[PDB]
Amino acid sequence: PMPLLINLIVSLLGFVATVTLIPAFRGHFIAARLCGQDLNKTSRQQIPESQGVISGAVFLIILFCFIPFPFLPHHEFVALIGALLAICCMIFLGFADDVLNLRWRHKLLLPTAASLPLLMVYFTNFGNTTIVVHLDLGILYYVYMGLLAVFCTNAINILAGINGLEAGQSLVISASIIVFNLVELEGDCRDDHVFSLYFMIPFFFTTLGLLYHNWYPSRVFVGDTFCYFAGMTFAGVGILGHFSKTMLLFFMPQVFNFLYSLPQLLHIIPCPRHRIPRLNIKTGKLEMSYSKFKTKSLSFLGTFILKVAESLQLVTVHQSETEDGEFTECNNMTLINLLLKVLGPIHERNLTLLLLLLQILGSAITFSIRYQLVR
């Protein structure tokens, strides 16, 4: 593990670099108007946004320096430069979307745009287009790879709204991939897991440096730049490491949160501006958020999904009648608000930690399935 040693050293220098640079560039983001208030806090102070650009930049420089060490044969090098191009492009287009706030339709095209070098590397390095249930997907396999980048970013991005969640969930996911890579390094696929480690170790330590400042009480915000960055690094290693299926199982709390959010996101059930919990100033803890709307304006499909989700004991429905008419106060559909439905009001630092623990539980479940640990 001669290049893995060098990779671990540069990753630790990168942790120190992220911890040091994030407060150094604070002034620049504030002056750039790249800052906002922490909605779940009584404090009206502006906190710098998109700090995922600094940890993402540190990540790139770390790996740019690392590039000659695995070699010091081009088939594994093409994937290394190719994966770095896809990730770099994503950190770029991610930060551009943060700064410019592009339309949701253009936002979904950005990950497929940046994932193109991985698809081309998989094409030139003759990647297995076949899948095991034995079915050759061919063109539909490249559509999967293209949509994998789009998924991971938005899956992380829609499971957010509380300090240290986005960086924290990514640390559990990247640490799970590190553990999995190490176990599978000993035999069989050594090349596919040594490659994945080369990106996961620097991703873990740069994110650690970011979480140092994002963790409760949030000093900085990670921004959509970090979600874009994280999403592509995970899609990158999963695609070129061929463990995309195993990797998507580490995305279990995200897969649930996405599908539970889907009726609100698609506006089948009314969706407000912010579906984040409401902080009770007297309590100090975070309480559930609600989406009240007219019952007559609601669609037949929307009335069905909301009634099935109520019968499944997932959504709290509160009926009311005013002078304007009859309105339905539906619970905001997200894993954060569902945890407050089940466990009552929870403080922000404990609520994130609980979702991080939930992320650990799912990873243990994945590992137990894959290595026979149920008994």
Spatial strand order in the sheet of 290-294: 290-294, 326-331, 317-321
CB burial of residue 196 (10 Å; 0-12, 13-18, 19+): buried
Q: What is the resolution of this structure in A?
A: 3.2
Residue 375 labeled ligand binder: no
Distance CA 39, CA 277 (A): 10
Same-domain pairing of 124 and 240: yes
Q: Is 103 annotated as a binding residue?
A: no
Alpha-carbon gap, residue 151 to 155, rounded angstroms:
6
- In 215-347, alpha helices (H): 223-240, 244-248, 252-265, 300-311, 335-343
154 belongs to an annotated ligand binding site: yes
d(CA 184, CA 172): 18
Domain range holding 1?
Answer: 1-250+347-375
Asked if the bond preceding 217 is cis, omega within 30° of 0, the reply is yes
Give 317's strand partners. 330
- Reduce the DSSP state of residue 347 to 3 states and report it: coil
101 in a known ligand binding site: yes
Question: Is 194 marked as a binding-site residue?
Answer: no
Does 158 carry a binding-site annotation? yes
Residues 164 and 307 in one domain: no
**157 annotated binding-site participant:** yes
DSSP of 61-74, one letter per residue? Answer: HHHHHHTHHHH--H
**Would the annotation count 139 as a binding residue?**
no
Asked if 225 contacts 53 with a C-beta cutoff of 8 angstroms, the reply is: yes
Give the distance from CA 206 to its chain's centroid.
15
Residue 163 labeled ligand binder: yes
DSSP string, 136-170: E-THHHHHHHHHHHHHHHHHHHHS-SSTTHHHHHH
Asked if residues 201 and 8 have their Cβ atoms less than 8 Å apart, the reply is yes
- Shared-domain flag, residues 175 and 220: yes
Judgement on whether residues 164 and 268 belong to the same structural domain of the protein: no
Please indicate, yes or no, whether residues 264 and 184 belong to a single structural domain of this protein: no
- The C-alpha angle with vertex 342 and arms to 259 and 274, in degrees rounded to 5, equals 55
Same domain, 140 and 205: yes
Strand, coil or helix: what is 185?
A: coil
Instruction: Tell me: do 202 and 240 sit in the same domain.
Output: yes
- Residue 42 annotated as binding site: no
Q: Is 344 left (phi over 0), alpha (psi -120 to 50) or beta?
A: left
Binding residue per annotation — 44? no
310 lies in the same domain as 296: yes
Q: Are residues 95 and 11 part of one domain?
A: yes
> In terms of domains, do 357 and 218 share one?
yes
Rounded to 5 degrees, φ, ψ at 131 are -130, 155
Q: How many CB atoms lie within 10 A of CB 6?
A: 16
Tell me: is residue 49 an annotated ligand-binding position: yes
Q: How many domains does the chain have?
A: 2
Q: Is 193 marked within a binding site? A: no
Q: How far apart are CA 157 and CA 221, in angstroms?
A: 13
**214 labelled binding-site residue:** no
Whether 38 has a binding-site annotation, put simply, is yes
| Helix pair 348-371, 335-343: axis angle to 10 deg | 100
The closest alpha carbon to 287, from 184, 192, 169, 162, belongs to 162
Same domain, 206 and 234: yes
Is the same domain home to 317 and 375?
Answer: no
CA gap 310, 330 in Å, rounded? 10
153 annotated as belonging to a binding site for a ligand: yes
Cα angle 313, 316, 321 (rounded to 5 degrees) comes to 140
